[PDB]
Amino acid sequence: AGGAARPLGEFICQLCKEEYADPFALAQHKCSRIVRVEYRCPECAKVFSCPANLASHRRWHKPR
């Protein structure tokens, strides 16, 4: 898990989409992200480089 997580210290950019809860990483925050096709899943934090398998992966999160 990690602990009691919520929007505290974290800046989430709209354009570069970089997100850091670590205050040191906001001081080192460098806006410039080549974000072609990458989708992070909340629980399965490993990023998917494809949209189609991601859609089938959401079907895996869908109940009956």
Q: Site residues (CB under 5 A) for Zn ion?
A: 13, 16, 18, 31, 41, 44
Q: How far is the CB of 64 from Zn ion (least distance, A)?
A: 17
Q: Up-side HSE of residue 47: CA atoms within 13 Å toward CB? A: 6
Nearer to Zn ion, 13 or 50 (CB): 13
Q: Tell me the C-alpha distance between 41 and 33, whole Å.
A: 18
Min dist CB 40 to Zn ion, Å, is: 9
From the CB of 39, what's the least distance to Zn ion, in Å? 10
Q: SS3 of 60, please? A: helix
